[PDB]
Amino acid sequence: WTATSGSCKGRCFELQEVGPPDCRCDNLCKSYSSCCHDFDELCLKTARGWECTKDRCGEVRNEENACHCSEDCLSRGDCCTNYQVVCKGESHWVDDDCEEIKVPECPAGFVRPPLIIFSVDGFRASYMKKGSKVMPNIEKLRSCGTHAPYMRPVYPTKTFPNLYTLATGLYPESHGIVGNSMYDPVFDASFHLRGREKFNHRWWGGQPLWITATKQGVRAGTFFWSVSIPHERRILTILQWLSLPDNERPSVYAFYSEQPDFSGHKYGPFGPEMTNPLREIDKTVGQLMDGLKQLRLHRCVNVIFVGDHGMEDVTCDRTEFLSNYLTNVDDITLVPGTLGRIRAKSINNSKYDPKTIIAALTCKKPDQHFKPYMKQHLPKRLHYANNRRIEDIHLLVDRRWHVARKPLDVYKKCFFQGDHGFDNKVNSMQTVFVGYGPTFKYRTKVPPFENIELYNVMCDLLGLKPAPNNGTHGSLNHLLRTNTFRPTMPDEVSRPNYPGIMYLQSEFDLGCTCDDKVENKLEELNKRLHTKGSTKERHLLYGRPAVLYRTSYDILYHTDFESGYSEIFLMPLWTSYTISKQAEVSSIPEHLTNCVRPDVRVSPGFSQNCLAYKNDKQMSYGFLFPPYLSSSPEAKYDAFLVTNMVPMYPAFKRVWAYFQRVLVKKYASERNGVNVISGPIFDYNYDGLRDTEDEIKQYVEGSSIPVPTHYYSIITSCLDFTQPADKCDGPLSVSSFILPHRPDNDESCNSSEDESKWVEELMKMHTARVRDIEHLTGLDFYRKTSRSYSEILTLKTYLHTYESE
Ligand SMILES: *[C@@H]1O[C@H](CO)[C@@H](O[C@@H]2O[C@H](CO)[C@@H](O[C@@H]3O[C@H](CO[C@H]4O[C@H](CO)[C@@H](O)[C@H](O[C@H]5O[C@H](CO)[C@@H](O)[C@H](O)[C@@H]5O[C@H]5O[C@H](CO)[C@@H](O)[C@H](O)[C@@H]5O)[C@@H]4O)[C@@H](O)[C@H](O[C@H]4O[C@H](CO)[C@@H](O)[C@H](O)[C@@H]4O[C@H]4O[C@H](CO)[C@@H](O)[C@H](O)[C@@H]4O)[C@@H]3O)[C@H](O)[C@H]2NC(C)=O)[C@H](O)[C@H]1NC(C)=O
Ligand SMILES: Cc1cc(OCC2=NNC(=O)CC2)c(C(C)(C)C)cc1C#N
Ligand SMILES: [Ca+2]
Ligand SMILES: [Ca+2]
Ligand code: NA
Ligand code: NA
Ligand SMILES: [Zn+2]
């Protein structure tokens, strides 16, 4: 209950919220039913529309007008954006030539370049090229400023998740906005696009930019714009705020457009009806820039033109129904559309079996347009598991499709031709970034990056210290003319031990066998050189990874590979090896099929044992350095060390063997050598972070040998592939993956066929950034290179997506 009897007289778009029930005059007042009685009359004037015409020039001020063409208007800060153009023969900003902004050119009293974030809903990355002919203002920003070919949104590629990620630098699983539609089982409450529930602050975690700014003495404009406030009024309001006195004036502003998303849904992404929404947005941008130029701020303000997600072709008829797969379909609740999330219709039901539901949705139709997943088995690159609002069962839907529970949901809710929300690697979901202003670079193209990185940059642009977030600060330094942040490497916490030969064969009782005994003096200096690190410059190209937590671990050198062997987990944390373009693949000889060999540098008590694997009927083993890529029969023996062994499900060994026997060599042939770092990952509580040993839920039966949830590899080579990986003078090229360590291959519907038809497809789905692997291992890679740290940070955030162009 309000008493909306107060006035908005002199308080239109006031910047501080006033507390109940003395009434309100700000964007949110609409949404709360709390506007003063005279809000529309005073604050949302429309009279005479939004453009000066020559006949209004010098007019006598009429305070009813939407905007002003009177002589006093620049001082009052309320001219129509085109005032100078119409009434003073000035040029539109877009018609001016691009001139480098080497320094901020700000009015007296401006302590810092303001930041304006101009966000556009559903603005697909390819619109920059495909609609360039009707967006001249946007094209000027893009070509004159800093731009990426695209920006990667977060999953799901929906509006609120991506807008709140822009604002916080956090993954949805961390900020809490995991969908445009959510059920929180603790609140027993649903968040939806319509309704008041979405306004409760309990949904919104993390620290958004406007709060970071306010806590550190920097004022912010509104970020939320009521849908009924027209765009012309949003721009005018931002420009009026910018004319405030120095002590009152915000330093950070946002504009938001519902277009082009709104039309895109109706007409599809490239429907002929889309040309006009693009024209309209461009004109808004023109308004803002003409407004800035009037206020002499057009070479002072940093402008970010950014999208939340793209748009794909999606029609009613491309709908998969769960009623076609399940008998029991009236027992579940589905969050439907371009993703699926399934939970039990009734919490009072231990007669709900996720496994039966998954099984009924797996590889059931040859052409099935969705794939079910327990959330912990989703590609780790999506970071979409660690929140109670994310249901245990998830459906990843194919681009261009929808999922629904029953047909009646689709005609008793055709309408739409476009939608979004698919996997964030999908080309159609990619969106836009341009930065323009004194702090951004001039006429510069940067590589595509993820939207989680922007919070840090926006904080830099405003001299703020970012709250803790999922960006890698320094990874986007290359966007900026002048950086206030100088990243440095994290310090190594645990130093390795370098053990020599300390144990006799007979001290081991590991239950292992190997056929390995066959009697030269100059090649027993040579083997000792290898165990000492003589080849380490070849196999460890970028320094040893730094261990960033307290543990006990040993560096082990070998002719063909180096490892960091954990005495706690009883297996390598990491194993590094270089495979040249010329290298040969060989088999595991017959006599060495079951060979495992005690490592005389490591105590029986810190070693795995073969008996455990014998007794564990589910669990087998693999090797991190592959025996198949041994440099010589003699070096091959090293690959069968117990210290190179790791626990693997037989089903997983199909994947791993194919990767080690076939794919490594292919990549070395295509990339002119590769360096490989492989290792285990433990993330039993699916938080994206390295587990402590007291969090492991599975061990090889009757042992202390922990079972990894995933296995990673980082495959690095020279960006200039005319140089071999091991003699690379310049920038690097990386691809990586985090493969789920699963006792079945149900994820891959063709897994009954030869590995050549499905393994690589699986691996591509589980593509990862180096940074993802860092979070999951507490390791820090690329410690010793010839490259700047900023560049290395960019490299560690790279994701190889395996999309077309
Ligand atoms: C991406 O970046 C983010 C941001 O940096 C990383 O997220 C951080 O992860 C940290 C480590 O996991 C985590 O630290 C914990 O903080 C607890 C304090 O929590 C409150 O205060 C802060 C600060 O202002 C606040 O941000 C928190 O935010 C959550 O609160 C609610 C959740 O209901 C949401 O509104 C909000 O979105 C956010 O939710 C998200 O995080 C929570 C966990 O915090 C998840 O469960 C949600 O699903 C969601 O993802 C809080 O409001 C603090 O209490 C913890 O301390 C315990 O654990 C340490 C471990 O070493 C231990 O030493 C202590 O003993 C302590 O133990 C006691 O508690 C245990 C656990 O409850 C208990 O079992 C023990 O027996 C003890 O009693 C912990 O330090 C930090 O909160 C988040 N920040 C955010 C915003 O999420 C994320 O890791 C990055 N991602 C990647 C992939 O790198
Ligand atoms: C630029 C920006 C705009 C935003 O809100 C815009 C908006 N206005 N009106 C609506 O009806 C839809 C959403 C937001 C949120 C988090 C407040 C949603 C964040 C960010 C960022 N960074
Ligand atoms: Ca959107
Ligand atoms: Ca974990
Ligand atoms: Na076994
Ligand atoms: Na399968
Ligand atoms: Zn939309």
Upper half-sphere CA count for residue 457 (Cβ side, 13 Å): 26
Burial of 6 (0-12, 13-18, 19+ CB in 10 A): middle
Rounded to 5 degrees, φ, ψ at 547 are -85, 120
- Number of alpha helices (DSSP H) and beta strands (DSSP E) in the chain: 24, 29
Rounded distance from Cα 221 to ligand 1 centre (Å): 29
3 state DSSP class of 781: coil
Say whether 530 counts as a known binding-site residue: no
- The verdict on the CB of residue 224 being under 6 Å from ligand 2 is yes
Rounded to 5 degrees, φ, ψ at 474 are 110, -25
- The verdict on the CB of residue 387 being under 6 Å from ligand 1 is yes
Catalytically annotated residue among 159, 165, 439, 643: 159
Rounded distance from Cα 174 to ligand 1 centre (Å): 9
Question: Which atom of ligand 2 has the smallest separation from the CA of 177?
Answer: 16
Verify cis geometry, omega within 30 degrees of 0, for the bond prior to 379. no
Say whether 308 counts as a known binding-site residue: yes
Rounded distance from Cα 224 to ligand 2 centre (Å): 5
Task: Give the residue from 214, 255, 236 showing the smallest Cα distance to 123.
Answer: 255
Report every protein residue that has its C-beta within 5 angstroms of ion ligand 6: 745, 748, 751
| 580-585 contacts, C-beta under 8 A, 24 or more apart | 580/668, 580/673, 580/724, 580/725, 580/726, 581/668, 581/669, 581/672, 581/673, 581/724, 583/629, 583/631, 583/665, 583/668, 585/628, 585/629, 585/661, 585/665
Bridge pairing between strands 449-450 and 151-152: parallel
Q: Structure tokens of 729? A: 């003078």
Burial of 629 (0-12, 13-18, 19+ CB in 10 A): buried
Task: Give the residue from 294, 353, 339 showing the smallest Cα distance to 172.
Answer: 339
Verify cis geometry, omega within 30 degrees of 0, for the bond prior to 208. no
Q: Are 427 and 804 in contact (CB under 8 A)?
A: yes
Of the listed ligands, the closest to the CA of 266 is 7
Residues in the chain: 805
Rounded distance from Cα 124 to ligand 3 centre (Å): 10
Say whether 689 counts as a known binding-site residue: yes
Q: How far is the C-alpha of 261 from the C-alpha of 508, rounded, in Å?
A: 66
Catalogue the E-assigned strands of 212-272.
252-260
Can 159 be counted among the known catalytic residues?
A: yes
Rounded distance from Cα 318 to ligand 2 centre (Å): 30
Q: What is the resolution of this structure in A?
A: 1.8
- The verdict on the CB of residue 173 being under 6 Å from ligand 1 is yes
CA distances from 768 to 380, 736, 796 (A): 7, 5, 10
Type of residue numbered 281: I
Question: Which atom of ligand 2 has the smallest separation from the CA of 254?
Answer: 1
- The verdict on the CB of residue 223 being under 6 Å from ligand 2 is yes
Yes or no: domain 505-797 corresponds to CATH 3.40.50.2300: no
- The verdict on the CB of residue 204 being under 6 Å from ligand 2 is no
Task: Give the residue from 149, 150, 138, 146 showing the smallest Cα distance to 443.
Answer: 146
Rounded distance from Cα 65 to ligand 5 centre (Å): 81
- The verdict on the CB of residue 389 being under 6 Å from ligand 1 is no
Say whether 420 counts as a known binding-site residue: yes
Q: How far is the C-alpha of 123 from the C-alpha of 150, rounded, in Å?
A: 11
Say whether 261 counts as a known binding-site residue: yes
Q: Are 634 and 586 in contact (CB under 8 A)?
A: no
Type of residue numbered 783: R
Of the listed ligands, the closest to the CA of 745 is 6
To 5 degrees, how large is the angle CA 667–CA 668–CA 671? Answer: 75
Experimental method, per PDB record:
X-ray
Q: How far is the C-alpha of 123 from the C-alpha of 310, rounded, in Å?
A: 5
Q: How far is the C-alpha of 25 from the C-alpha of 31, rounded, in Å?
A: 12
Q: How far is the C-alpha of 679 from the C-alpha of 571, rounded, in Å?
A: 9
Type of residue numbered 396: L
Residue identified by tokens 């057009």 is 298
Say whether 392 counts as a known binding-site residue: no
- Chain centroid to Cα 137, Å, comes to 29
Q: How far is the C-alpha of 529 from the C-alpha of 213, rounded, in Å?
A: 57
Type of residue numbered 660: Q
Rounded to 5 degrees, φ, ψ at 678 are -125, 155
Rounded distance from Cα 617 to ligand 5 centre (Å): 4
3 state DSSP class of 152: strand
- The verdict on the CB of residue 170 being under 6 Å from ligand 1 is yes
DSSP for residue 690:
P
Those residues whose C-beta lies under 8 Å from the C-beta of residue 325, and which sit 6 or more positions away, are 360, 361, 364, 365
Q: Whose CA is nearest to atom 20 of ligand 2?
A: 163
Number of CB atoms found within 10 A of residue 321's CB: 18
Q: Supply the Cα-derived Rg of the chain in whole angstroms.
A: 30
Q: Whose CA is nearest to atom 3 of ligand 2?
A: 223
Q: Structure tokens of 34? A: 């709390």
Q: Whose CA is nearest to atom 43 of ligand 1?
A: 174
Type of residue numbered 63: E
Q: How far is the C-alpha of 242 from the C-alpha of 295, rounded, in Å?
A: 8
Catalogue the E-assigned strands of 231-327.
252-260, 302-307, 312-313, 319-321
Rounded distance from Cα 309 to ligand 3 centre (Å): 6
CA distances from 421 to 152, 162, 400, 738 (A): 13, 10, 10, 23
Q: How far is the C-alpha of 150 from the C-alpha of 128, rounded, in Å?
A: 9
- The verdict on the CB of residue 211 being under 6 Å from ligand 1 is no
Residue identified by tokens 């794919």 is 663
| DSSP-assigned beta bridge partners for residue 306 | 119, 433
Rounded to 5 degrees, φ, ψ at 688 are 80, 10
Out of 155, 168, 174, mutate this one to test ligand 1's pocket (max ligand atoms within 8 Å of CB): namely 174
Q: Whose CA is nearest to atom 12 of ligand 1?
A: 687
3 state DSSP class of 38: coil
| DSSP-assigned beta bridge partners for residue 677 | 576, 714
Q: How far is the C-alpha of 71 from the C-alpha of 50, rounded, in Å?
A: 17
Q: How far is the C-alpha of 557 from the C-alpha of 625, rounded, in Å?
A: 12
Bridge pairing between strands 444-445 and 332-335: unpaired
Question: Which atom of ligand 2 has the smallest separation from the CA of 224?
Answer: 8
Type of residue numbered 189: A
Q: How far is the C-alpha of 702 from the C-alpha of 726, rounded, in Å?
A: 42
| DSSP-assigned beta bridge partners for residue 370 | 397
Those residues whose C-beta lies under 8 Å from the C-beta of residue 75, and which sit 6 or more positions away, are none
Say whether 369 counts as a known binding-site residue: no
Task: Give the residue from 247, 205, 240, 206 showing the smallest Cα distance to 222.
Answer: 240
Type of residue numbered 749: C
Q: Are 375 and 686 in contact (CB under 8 A)?
A: yes
Bridge pairing between strands 732-740 and 710-718: antiparallel
Q: Structure tokens of 328? A: 């029991």
Out of 119, 234, 456, mutate this one to test ligand 2's pocket (max ligand atoms within 8 Å of CB): namely 119
Report every protein residue that has its C-beta within 5 angstroms of ion ligand 3: 121, 159, 261, 308
Type of residue numbered 658: Y
Those residues whose C-beta lies under 8 Å from the C-beta of residue 354, and which sit 6 or more positions away, are 374, 392, 393
Say whether 691 counts as a known binding-site residue: yes
Q: Which helix (DSSP H) or strand (DSSP E) does residue 669 occupy?
A: helix 664-671
**CB burial string 660-676: b at 16+ within 10 A, e below:** bbbbbbebbeebbbbbb
Out of 163, 237, 261, mutate this one to test ligand 2's pocket (max ligand atoms within 8 Å of CB): namely 163
Q: How far is the C-alpha of 700 from the C-alpha of 618, rounded, in Å?
A: 9
- Chain centroid to Cα 44, Å, comes to 39
Verify cis geometry, omega within 30 degrees of 0, for the bond prior to 156. yes
Task: Give the residue from 529, 623, 536 showing the smallest Cα distance to 578.
Answer: 536
Q: How far is the C-alpha of 515 from the C-alpha of 185, rounded, in Å?
A: 58
Q: Are 247 and 109 in contact (CB under 8 A)?
A: no
Those residues whose C-beta lies under 8 Å from the C-beta of residue 234, and which sit 6 or more positions away, are 225, 255, 256
- Chain centroid to Cα 755, Å, comes to 29
CA distances from 38 to 44, 45, 301 (A): 10, 11, 33
